[PDB]
């Protein structure tokens, strides 16, 4: 019956079937309960959408159309929860936040 | 050659959904693929440990919800739990 996919059944963009296959073959459990890839794909899609929206906002404030890893770093480090999630994570070609300590300024 | 899979078309679909004027570079796509794989590994490992602690041999959406409550910080975890519950409800209500 035309073989509609599970992501369109769940109304997602991230693949339910590929996430199910990676959960099955990734040596996590004996069984996968078939609603777990839907939840996983939804959580991954939400986190991707939040990061991409903040990075696109940073690129728009930087007057750039395209997102570079600097925009991803500026999106992640300016958010407390995103920086808590990726505290031990290095983003390549992302740089650092502009931050000079207040004592080092003149006068 | 050998067909290596990624999340590039999926992240691009999400990006064109939330920003239908804004492109992305190859390096930023590599960052996004690494992010999705890392968070997948974290949530799946936490759900695997949660299933192993309670003498369960399956991973259900309850294990994934509890893992999302564990790794993710507060409002991030709350909105991710809302998104996952909405998706599982839509998947169950529609075959």
């Amino acid at each position: 019956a035309k073989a509609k996919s599970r992501s369109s059944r769940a109304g997602l963009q991230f693949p339910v079937g590929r996430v199910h296959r990676l959960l099955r073959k990734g040596n996590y459990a004996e069984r996968v309960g078939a609603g777990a890839p839907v939840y996983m794909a939804a959580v991954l899609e939400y986190l991707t959408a939040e990061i991409l929206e903040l990075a696109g906002n940073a690129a728009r404030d930087n007057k750039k159309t395209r997102i570079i890893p600097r925009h991803l770093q500026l999106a992640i480090r300016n958010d407390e929860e995103l920086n808590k999630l990726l505290g031990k994570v290095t983003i390549a070609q992302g740089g650092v936040l502009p931050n000079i300590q207040a004592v080092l300024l003149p006068k | 050659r050998s067909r290596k899979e990624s999340y590039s078309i999926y992240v691009y679909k999400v990006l064109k959904q939330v920003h239908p004027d804004t492109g992305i570079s190859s390096k930023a796509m590599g960052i996004m693929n690494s992010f999705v794989n890392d968070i997948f590994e974290r949530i799946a490992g936490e759900a695997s440990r949660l299933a192993h602690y309670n003498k369960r041999s399956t991973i259900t959406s309850r294990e994934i919800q509890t893992a999302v409550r564990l790794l993710l910080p507060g409002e991030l975890a709350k909105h991710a739990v809302s998104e996952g519950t909405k998706a599982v409800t839509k998947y169950t209500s529609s075959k």
Partner: single-chain antibody
Amino acid sequence: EVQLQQSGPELVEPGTSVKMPCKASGYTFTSYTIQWVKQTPRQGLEWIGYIYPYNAGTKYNEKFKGKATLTSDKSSSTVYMELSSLTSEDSAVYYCARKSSRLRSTLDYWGQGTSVTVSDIKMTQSPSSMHASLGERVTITCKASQDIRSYLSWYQQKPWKSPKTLIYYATSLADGVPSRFSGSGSGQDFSLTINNLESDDTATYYCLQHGESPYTFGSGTKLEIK
């Protein structure tokens, strides 16, 4: 748990400056922005700006740029608001509200508001004022001038009280709000539905967009029962 303590009313002479405290408790203070909303009976609610205590990040409305100054003090968990060069049109109630840095999140918990007396995208709400019975259905429209990605919230305000968050993300219910209220719509067309009425529902209902950089409230509907 979560509360935003605000000071009493101010009787200020014009041309001076006034400080406003927003002492906060019950949550991790640095992880949530504090927004400031001004409320006059002639222009309704107007979003002024916000402070992020994580990086002390400011953002102001264009009509309040320079006139308003936001500061944060993380030691006492306090947010300060400065108004300088007080024009006679400053007699208004000022609320400070908590809002997470997540885009889906809204102004969930509000302060009591300080009454100060001097001595973009436009939300169109179709019913200005309507009458409903004790068990009728209420439908309120919030037609938007531009497009927003479902970033609309519905608030209920009693007379002489702080607004109460009903609906966030245009469909999701707030914490503690009963399931009688139901939000619907997306894009430019939104609606709030009250299922069955009580005597509590005599209030003014507003819709706020936060999909773009200037946040805009709606005109508001006055709903009174019997």
